[PDB]
């Protein structure tokens, strides 16, 4: 119930609270995949936000959340330092840049 500062029972949720709920479950890793999908893949979306704004708030935690043994990732090919400076294209269930209840995390661009 992500309600504003001082507010409660004003009319309904997802209308006044000015927030939402979105999850990520597409593809990123092979060993530490659940670390960013199960450990914490849920995030809140304000009222006025862009699909690109979440690419800086969602990918963030994905870093500190997946920093168990970067020494290995870098040895396999997966860079942890790049994740913080990489592009996060949030896709939908239709194949577009949407931020619905569930948005996929694709590395490749939309089409541009």
UniProtKB/Swiss-Prot annotation:
Its cofactor is Zn(2+). It is found in: Host membrane; Host cytoplasm. Residues 4-112 form the Ubiquitin-like domain. It catalyses: Thiol-dependent hydrolysis of ester, thioester, amide, peptide and isopeptide bonds formed by the C-terminal Gly of ubiquitin (a 76-residue protein attached to proteins as an intracellular targeting signal). It is a multi-pass membrane protein. Responsible for the cleavages located at the N-terminus of the replicase polyprotein. In addition, PL-PRO possesses a deubiquitinating/deISGylating activity and processes both 'Lys-48'- and 'Lys-63'-linked polyubiquitin chains from cellular substrates. Plays a role in host membrane rearrangement that leads to creation of cytoplasmic double-membrane vesicles (DMV) necessary for viral replication. Nsp3, nsp4 and nsp6 together are sufficient to form DMV. The hydrophobic region HD1 probably mediates the membrane association of the replication complex. This is Papain-like protease nsp3. The chain holds residues 819 to 930 of 7073 of the full protein.
């Amino acid at each position: 119930a992500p309600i504003k500062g001082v507010t409660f029972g004003e009319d309904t949720v997802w209308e006044v609270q000015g927030y939402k709920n979105v999850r990520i479950t597409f593809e990123l890793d092979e060993r530490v995949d659940k670390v960013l999908n199960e450990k914490c893949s849920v995030y809140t979306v304000e009222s006025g936000t862009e699909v690109t704004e979440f690419a800086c708030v969602v990918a963030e935690a994905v870093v500190k959340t997946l920093q168990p043994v970067s020494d290995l990732l870098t040895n396999m090919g997966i860079d942890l330092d790049e994740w913080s400076v990489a592009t996060f294209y949030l896709f939908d269930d239709a194949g577009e840049e949407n931020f619905s209840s569930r948005m996929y995390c694709s590395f490749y661009p939309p089409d541009e």
